[PDB]
Ligand SMILES: O=C(O)CNC(=O)C(=O)O
Ligand SMILES: [Mg+2]
């Protein structure tokens with residue numbers, strides 16, 4: 430069995446290997462990458478996403494989200510308070526202001542320590558989930574707006590034609606902006622490209638151990654767990670590495686820098702934080718190996734998780750027994 434300790438693997442494809450996206454995902458899996466839940470892909474030196482980032486300031490963040498924490502430093506929830514619209518140029522200035530800028534630090538480890546110590550005492554503002562793309566239309570390799578769609582994959586594998594579309598999303602971050610512990614909708618893959626700016630630190634639980642994280646989460650968030658049998662789908666709970674280690678939960682960590690891709694694998698729980706002003710682009714995708722994970726994915730039916738139009742067909746076709754209850758939660 431490849432990668433039996435479930436370590437995060439890092440890949441350096443050549444320009445030739447960067448042509449066929451599906452083939453390279455399958456290659457990574459042949460080497461055991463999926464066992465970690467997360468892999469890093471460093472593009473060949475010949476590749477670029479676009480020519481420059483000098484002309485992005487007029488992009489609108491229609492609903493910036495202020496991430497307000499409750500709990501203790503290693504075990505907290507966050508809620509998202511909606512703020513007035515602002516442009517990327519206004520948001521970058523805000524990120525760099527004395528109130529929100531990254532503190533002086535020695536290295537990534539020192540900054541990680543400061544994050545876990547101090548996150549709860551601040552409320553950073555995240556420009557998340559903005560439909561759009563920063564890949565040049567002429568970039569033919571690993572262009573996240575030109576991937577094969579999940580609807581087409583389900584059709585190729587299972588024969589059923591379904592409605593829905595699959596497009597990328599932009600994330601504009603600042604120091605302390607946080608992504609809570611989650612797997613993807615329908616336990617899909619995700620791919621994330623850090624276009625510019627400061628790093629993003631990730632934490633991940635191997636898919637084979639995801640239920641250990643869930644059991645801890647039910648212990649640590651007992652009211653939430655009573656409210657919903659899949660409350661991590663709400664994407665609001667944080668647990669620190671120190672707490673994970675105290676409770677024996679298997680995980681790994683890695684820092685992504687500008688110019689790097691990360692791939693999350695089906696049912697790989699992940700969480701993390703941004704180091705300073707940055708911009709990422711991400712999208713969900715599927716492969717043939719995903720289908721069995723989609724069929725078994727948990728679902729939130731309490732009303733909180735509320736998701737895209739395109740998840741309807743996935744539930745309807747892969748999970749017909751669950752469909753009626755899930756759809757009630759949507760309405
Ligand atoms: O970058 C973020 O805020 C969150 N991204 C992801 O969870 C992802 O790419 O799957
Ligand atoms: Mg612009």
Ligand code: NI
Nearest residue numbers: 612613619693
């Ligand atoms: Ni994710």
Ligand SMILES: [Zn+2]
Nearest residue numbers: 657729731733
């Ligand atoms: Zn729920």
